Amino acid sequence: GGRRAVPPNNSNAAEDDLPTVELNVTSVHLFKERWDTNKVDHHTDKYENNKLIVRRGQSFYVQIDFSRPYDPRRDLFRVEYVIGRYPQENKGTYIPVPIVSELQSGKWGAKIVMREDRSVRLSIQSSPKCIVGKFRMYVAVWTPYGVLRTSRNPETDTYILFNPWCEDDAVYLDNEKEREEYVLNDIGVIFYGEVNDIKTRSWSYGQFEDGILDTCLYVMDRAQMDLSGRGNPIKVSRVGSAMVNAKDDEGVLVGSWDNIYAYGVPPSAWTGSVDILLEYRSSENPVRYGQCWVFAGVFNTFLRCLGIPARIVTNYFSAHDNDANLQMDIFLEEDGNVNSKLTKDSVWNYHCWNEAWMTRPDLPVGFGGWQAVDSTPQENSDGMYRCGPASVQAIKHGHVCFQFDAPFVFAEVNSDLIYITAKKDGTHVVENVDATHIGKLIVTKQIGGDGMMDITDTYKFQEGQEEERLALETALMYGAKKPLNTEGVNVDMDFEVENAVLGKDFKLSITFRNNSHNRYTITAYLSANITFYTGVPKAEFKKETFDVTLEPLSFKKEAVLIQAGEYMGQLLEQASLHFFVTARINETRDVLAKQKSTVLTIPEIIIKVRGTQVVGSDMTVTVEFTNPLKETLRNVWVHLDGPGVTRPMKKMFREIRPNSTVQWEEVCRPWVSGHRKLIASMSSDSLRHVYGELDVQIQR
């Protein structure tokens, strides 16, 4: 056909039927059953699936009943696995599994583990590099006139996932604790807020829930992904992440940061990946709407479900859309005030990306392990896409020369803020530089429980360390950018905001230390704005200039008060507030700068249960939320979730008068034993990004 002899098979759903005729089998028994050896041994017993699911590079048992006794003399047969529509032994999409005296490592094969009166028990092993997907099983009998082969049989469809338990698999992770956490765990916690006030919230990955695995295969099919590569964790993450953010009626989620969300579910409402993945599957069109942590919850569900050890990572004060520039420009005016016309770039209060576990045989030795993949697009070499998989280890050392998109995730965590006064005659002069703001704290969920784990030391060295300065020296050599010459760049200023609840008042003190044996005349300015979590300004709710005289060896503190009415009028979804404080030392003309952010605390949702905490047993769940506003919250949606206990659900209240409390009781029949969890979220026409949860423990 001009282009290629055979078309590409980039669909695991398209199937071809192998001919039945160019000894015979009567029944093929696999030991599926979620209690049986196979599933229990492959660690695929939690999957709500009624087919055999194994993990590559490992043996599993199967049994073939022949019409007559298998005789090693005049008999010859082999099990066949085939995927997609144009199988090719050449591409790994047609695997003849030959009978062997013993199984070698890294090769396919079947040992006749035992035979008894017309049946043969088999031990089948698979290559540790096997294509991940859902294969078809057949049994071929090689007669002197042609192969005789089984008919199409759905109940034998075997799923072959990645295998972090196998040391020959690139996805290998050598620690059962981590294995459980990064692969087996189907509940997760997402960190946000601001570096000073870390807020957490649970998300449901739900990889083992009914259907999720088949949709993970659907995304790939939708990406027209060559089957020959689904066995590559790299290209798998490379393609998988590009599918997450809907590039025009294409991907999974439709991103959006417009506090309206004109026609869908506000990003702040979702409780997990489940209903999201199932909605994409059923509608077959992008789901509206999503934002970083959402994209992150979903991509993580996709990975874990296939068996690639993944986890979500949150960076505080993220320099997004850096275009590999290591500098953020803050434009101060001649008298010292932040210039709003020019200052157009912002630091995100926080940003969430993923890390995947794998080896990097495409790079030198030492860069394998955790890989950074950011599904939130930004301009990189290809032009506005997801970034990664970039080796966190190389990032740490500044080796941004190795793929993929490493110079852009490096800048997310290493940028500097440059305070530059643009003279009114059209000139510039950089007054100061803040090397310590961006990438102040990078964090993730710990292995034990719902705690926090500081993984900052992994992306970067400690400041001042030559290794730190070296990584910069290196980064700068292969694509890092520091366009402004910061040449020549004794008062110590710093301020603090006390965190408050939504609707209440708070203080913001400014401290001024003067170590010199002399006095100064400072002129300060406080500028408070209302911002999106991305750090983008909506408005300046409070401006305030100060006039401070500093005696030598003086230390003066001033206290400003932010009254609730000064902000309650114009707040945004995540309750973010940004503070800028700059000063001029009239004598020497030095400009001091400092900026911080805070979020207002939102009261949680209450989840309470009564009944029988037993699988199969009806257990009633009670949900209740109190509208803590002096206004009536309209069109209130409360979301309920809890994998293994409840499928996701949601309810709506036309309105909730100021200060009244609602309640929602639904009865669930927990289908999983052990510690499970219940998760709630709130979203209305105004207040949203409200969450609640509960630690149930199902019995049986």
Q: Which of the residues are catalytic?
A: 292, 351, 374
Residue in 23, 189, 447, 536 binding a copy of itself, rule: CB under 8 A? 536
**Cis, peptide link before residue 205, omega less than 30° from 0:** no
- Say if CB 166 and CB 263 are below 8 A apart: no
Interhelix angle 233-244/212-222, rounded to 10 degrees, is 90
For tokens 């417009």, what's the residue? Answer: 258
Residue in 421, 534, 582, 598 binding a copy of itself, rule: CB under 8 A? 534
Residue 229 touches a copy of itself, criterion: CB under 8 A:
yes
Report the alpha-carbon distance of residue 373 to residue 310 in Å, rounded. Answer: 10
Smaller CB distance to a copy of itself: residue 234 or 298? 234
Binding partner selected for residue 435 from a copy of itself, Sr ion, none, CB under the kind-specific 5 to 8 Å limit: Sr ion
Smaller CB distance to a copy of itself: residue 380 or 627? 380
Residue 255 touches a copy of itself, criterion: CB under 8 A:
yes
Residue in 148, 171, 213, 234 binding a copy of itself, rule: CB under 8 A? 234
468 is in an annotated binding site: yes
176 is in an annotated binding site: no
Residue 375: CB atoms within 10 Å = 31
Smaller CB distance to a copy of itself: residue 429 or 453? 429
Report the alpha-carbon distance of residue 582 to residue 420 in Å, rounded. Answer: 12
Q: Write down the least CB distance from residue 163 to a copy of itself, Å.
A: 20
Smaller CB distance to a copy of itself: residue 42 or 386? 386
Residue in 321, 374, 412, 416 binding a copy of itself, rule: CB under 8 A? 321
22 is in an annotated binding site: no
**Span 24-63, contacts to a copy of itself by CB under 8 A:** none
What amino acid occupies position 170?
Answer: A
Got the DSSP string for 61-110?
Answer: EEEEEESS---TTT--EEEEEE-SSS--TTTTSEEEE-EESSPPTTS-EE
**b/e for 338-358, b at 16 or more Cβ within 10 A?**
beeeebebbbbbbbbbbbbbb
208 burial type by CB count under 10 A (0-12 exposed, 13-18 middle, 19+ buried): buried
Residue 393 touches a copy of itself, criterion: CB under 8 A:
no
From the list 340-348, 517-525, 548-556, 621-629, the region that binds a copy of itself by CB under 8 A is 340-348
Residue 74 touches a copy of itself, criterion: CB under 8 A:
no
Residue 652: CB atoms within 10 Å = 10
**Span 165-224, contacts to a copy of itself by CB under 8 A:** 223-224
Smaller CB distance to a copy of itself: residue 73 or 654? 73
- Say if CB 197 and CB 672 are below 8 A apart: no
- Say if CB 404 and CB 389 are below 8 A apart: yes
- Say if CB 87 and CB 93 are below 8 A apart: yes
Least Cα distance to 667 among 658, 678, 657 occurs for 678
Q: Write down the least CB distance from residue 332 to Sr ion, Å.
A: 21
604 is in an annotated binding site: no
In the chain, what is the straight-line distance between the N-terminal and C-terminal CA atoms, in Å? 60
Smaller CB distance to a copy of itself: residue 367 or 664? 367
Residue 617: CB atoms within 10 Å = 14
Number of residues that bind a copy of itself (CB under 8 A): 62
Residue 470 touches Sr ion, criterion: CB under 5 A:
no
Residue in 46, 103, 134, 142 binding a copy of itself, rule: CB under 8 A? 142
Residue 369 touches a copy of itself, criterion: CB under 8 A:
no
H-assigned helices in 348-397: 392-397
Binding partner selected for residue 167 from a copy of itself, Sr ion, none, CB under the kind-specific 5 to 8 Å limit: none
Residue 391 touches a copy of itself, criterion: CB under 8 A:
no
Residue in 130, 212, 216, 239 binding a copy of itself, rule: CB under 8 A? 239
Residue 6 touches Sr ion, criterion: CB under 5 A:
no
Hey, what are 664's tokens? 């929602």
Q: Which residues contact 149 (CB under 8 A, 6 or more apart)?
A: 18, 19, 20, 21, 80, 138, 139, 140, 141
Residue 435 touches Sr ion, criterion: CB under 5 A:
yes
Smaller CB distance to a copy of itself: residue 271 or 574? 574
Q: Which residues are annotated as a binding site?
A: 414, 416, 463, 468
Binding site for a copy of itself (CB under 8 A): 1-6, 76, 78, 88, 90, 96, 98, 142, 147, 223-226, 228-229, 234-235, 238-239, 242, 255-259, 321, 323, 329, 342, 344-346, 361-364, 379, 381-384, 400-404, 407, 425-426, 477-479, 532, 534, 536-537, 572
Annotated binding site for Ca(2+), which residues? Answer: 414, 416, 463, 468
Q: List residues binding Sr ion (CB under 5 A).
A: 435
